[PDB]
Design an enzyme around this catalytic site. Structure first.
Site, PDB file in Angstrom:
ATOM      1  CB  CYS A 102      -0.097   4.947   8.398  1.00 36.43           C
ATOM      2  SG  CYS A 102       0.938   6.341   7.995  1.00 36.43           S
ATOM      3  NE  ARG A 112       8.025  13.792   8.476  1.00 35.62           N
ATOM      4  CZ  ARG A 112       9.438  13.167   8.874  1.00 35.62           C
ATOM      5  NH1 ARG A 112       9.695  11.793   9.605  1.00 35.62           N
ATOM      6  NH2 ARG A 112      10.938  12.977   8.615  1.00 35.62           N
ATOM      7  NE  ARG A 150     -21.563  -7.689  21.885  1.00 28.58           N
ATOM      8  CZ  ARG A 150     -22.396  -7.271  22.623  1.00 28.58           C
ATOM      9  NH1 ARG A 150     -21.535  -6.310  23.731  1.00 28.58           N
ATOM     10  NH2 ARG A 150     -23.722  -6.961  22.186  1.00 28.58           N
ATOM     11  CG  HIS A 155       2.011  -3.133 -10.909  1.00 24.04           C
ATOM     12  ND1 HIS A 155       2.448  -1.801 -11.283  1.00 24.04           N
ATOM     13  CD2 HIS A 155       1.261  -3.796 -11.869  1.00 24.04           C
ATOM     14  CE1 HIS A 155       2.504  -1.569 -12.966  1.00 24.04           C
ATOM     15  NE2 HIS A 155       2.001  -2.686 -13.185  1.00 24.04           N
TER      16      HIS A 155
END
EC number: 2.1.1.45
Lengths: 264, 264
Positions: free
Chosen positions: A146, A21, A126, A51
């Site tokens: 994300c 973007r 499920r 880390h």
């Protein structure tokens, strides 16, 4: 890790030129899957030093449900500073959806409590799912999630989890995404008196940034080391009562850290 | 198809005994992915004859957004009869979420229009997503969506799509799930002046019912035939203006149909 380096090589070999973007270039593939048997070891990348301090605080923060960065700042965790407003607010990102998904009728749904009780009472189900993809709330979020959607599964006394990650920065983000969800599986399995199964990672737009290429070439030249071991030092009364100090990684012998930038 | 039969064999070889909500037994694995290059041919299973009549009507019905089964009954499509109430209502399943996802502030979001315009205006986007997993609405749905979440991707003039399917009946459902989304990719690509890319299928709880074992063994004994070809006979003015008669499959030379039951 073997699967991680195989992914990196695949993006190098087969990825197509694709911009983000901001206009920053990447090599990108669409659709990939990896599986980590958590009994083999804790899947923390060894071909560079990774880390986990910020990642552990972030996960506790998600589980707490408050999306102001105050708790992160109390611990000098700065990984969300870029997205926060003057008051430290991010909008209804991750934790708000995990703990208090808002509905049309004014309720707020605690998906994490829902899942814990499904795992304890109806482990064959499920539909043991947590979603962060609340379409109505996307515009108020500082950015769209994300790591968008995840599902749990129980068989033979073992808890597994699959994540759908719509967008993945292979070099900087993915090692941390893997470790965060692997930690979550350990925490949930402890709370449900289960053993750990597999973490299955599924990606959508899976990419290497062009300015991570030097780093990728270096990392691919290194041989993975034995996986480390997660120690949970204490069993809390619930999934919401974990503390930073409860977690230790033993047997972590990585290759040196490799720094990588971002564009603005 | 090769990938489909490989999945079936994997569930046979590696699946663990697992019951469904009715108590009916299955062999189950968790996490799988397959990729169909749509330029290779239309991915309709050839190792048994698969009828697409109901599947085409169902997809047009989803895209229309009304979840009453009246349109299905107008065409004697009966595949949702089991779940519908006396007035033909299903609750806010698939099409209601695709076309009119309800928000806390009283709006209704058309995800299909959103995606079409993202594809036309911002094809690089990493968030071209449709979700049916509206946590607030699950309880009113006749059943939770099995094909829960899908993402589109554009590169090199080609449209791809990945589906996350939380629960998959490998023998009876999956052939139809593949064909439905492959059709959708063709329709969207036509409307956006794109070529077809890949359909990537990702599964969560992926299972063979125990009473589909005879059928599975028979099917695995058959060699896949050449893929057929989808013909779209007319280009409509939009994604919402397709008609049943616009679609033809040519070059479909399947092995005979194989019947399989369900328990109640």
């Amino acid at each position: 890790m073997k699967q991680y380096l195989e992914l990196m090589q695949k993006v190098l070999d087969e990825g197509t030129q694709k911009n983000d973007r901001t206009g920053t270039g990447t090599l990108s593939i669409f659709g990939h899957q990896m599986r980590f048997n958590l009994q083999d070891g804790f899947p923390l990348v060894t071909t560079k030093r990774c880390h986990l301090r910020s990642i552990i605080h972030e996960l506790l923060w998600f589980l707490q449900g408050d999306t102001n960065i105050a708790y992160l700042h109390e611990n000098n965790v700065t990984i969300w500073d870029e997205w926060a407003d003057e008051n430290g607010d991010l909008g209804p990102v991750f934790g708000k959806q995990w703990r208090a998904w808002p509905t049309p009728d004014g309720r707020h749904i605690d998906q994490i409590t829902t899942v814990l009780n499904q795992l304890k009472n109806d482990p064959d189900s499920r539909r043991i799912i947590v979603s962060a993809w609340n379409v109505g709330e996307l515009d108020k979020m500082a950015l769209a999630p994300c790591h968008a959607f995840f599902q749990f599964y129980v068989a033979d006394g073992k808890l597994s989890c699959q994540l759908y990650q719509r967008s993945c920065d292979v070099f900087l983000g993915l090692p941390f995404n893997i470790a965060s969800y692997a930690l979550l599986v350990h925490m949930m399995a402890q709370q449900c008196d289960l053993e750990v199964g597999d973490f299955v990672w599924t990606g959508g737009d899976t990419h290497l940034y062009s300015n991570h290429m030097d780093q990728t070439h270096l990392q691919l030249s290194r041989e993975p080391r034995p996986l480390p071991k997660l120690i949970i030092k204490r069993k809390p009364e619930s999934i919401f009562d974990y503390r930073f100090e409860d977690f230790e990684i033993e047997g972590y012998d990585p290759h040196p850290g490799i720094k990588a930038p971002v564009a603005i």
